[PDB]
Amino acid sequence: MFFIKDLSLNITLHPSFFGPRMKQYLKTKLLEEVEGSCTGKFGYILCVLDYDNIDIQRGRILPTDGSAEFNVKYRAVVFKPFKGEVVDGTVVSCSQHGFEVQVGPMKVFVTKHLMPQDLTFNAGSNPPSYQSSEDVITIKSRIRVKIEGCISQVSSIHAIGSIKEDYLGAI
Amino acid sequence: RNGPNEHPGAKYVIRDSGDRIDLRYSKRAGDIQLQYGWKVERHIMDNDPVLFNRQP
């Protein structure tokens, strides 16, 4: 799911950037340290909105580091997965332990036990694929997956999905 | 270049990554090339401020 979130970050500036154009460096650091990053609390931080109007507060010199610590408030578009949510994606990898679906910046892992019984793994075909009477699931195929679990770490999110329920699977 | 056995000299070189180089056992590859932001742990020289104390 895509949300527009109000986020805060603590950025550190090396003393080498204590010049008349330090605010630009803070903006560059924000786009280089936040955009594309993953946080278990807010999901994948994708894009920073209103790049011209970030609120840069007064910086605090750290006692022994000598660097300035800036609190930065910004508005960003973040993708956060939730268990029980249904998403669409493209299969990127297939193996004996199931296939992986790519949904935006996230990869959902579908285990065999979360697949319908008829589906079976066929390593003989190149590329390997899951074959059943009605459909074939392979790399680049489009699958509707229901996220069954999400484990969020401070800098990583991994989810497991299922295609057993009705109206799921190959699109 | 002087090394750790001649005052004024130096004992360690610390790179920006946090790696510390003992100047003993380091001359095998020759003198190290210094870079900005590095640290040279060198002998305390003249006019260095130091705290001088007598107990009690």
Binding site: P15, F18, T64, G66 | -
Partner: protein
């Protein structure tokens, strides 16, 4: 921000304290040692502490001192506006 006293009613001394000068010189000296842009002209000087002293004398240290009060409130004083008389 109720703990930031507006500049028009600051009741603290307009003079830099000895501890404020010591930390400002040490703070700016450390920054100079880390290749910070020097805003004062150097007529020949390599010690970061001496460069900081030159900056303080010419009022070119871009720092402010957040003086804290025993109730949690604070006052912001620029190094340029603080009198260095001690």
């Amino acid at each position: 921000k109720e703990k930031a006293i507006p500049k028009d009613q600051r009741a603290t001394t307009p003079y830099m304290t000895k501890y404020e000068r010591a930390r400002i010189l040490g703070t700016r000296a450390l920054q100079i040692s880390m290749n910070a842009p020097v805003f004062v002209d150097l007529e020949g000087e390599t010690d970061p502490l001496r460069i900081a002293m030159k900056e303080l004398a010419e009022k070119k240290i871009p720092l402010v001192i957040r003086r804290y009060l025993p109730d949690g409130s604070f006052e912001d004083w620029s190094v340029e506006e603080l009198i260095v008389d001690l």
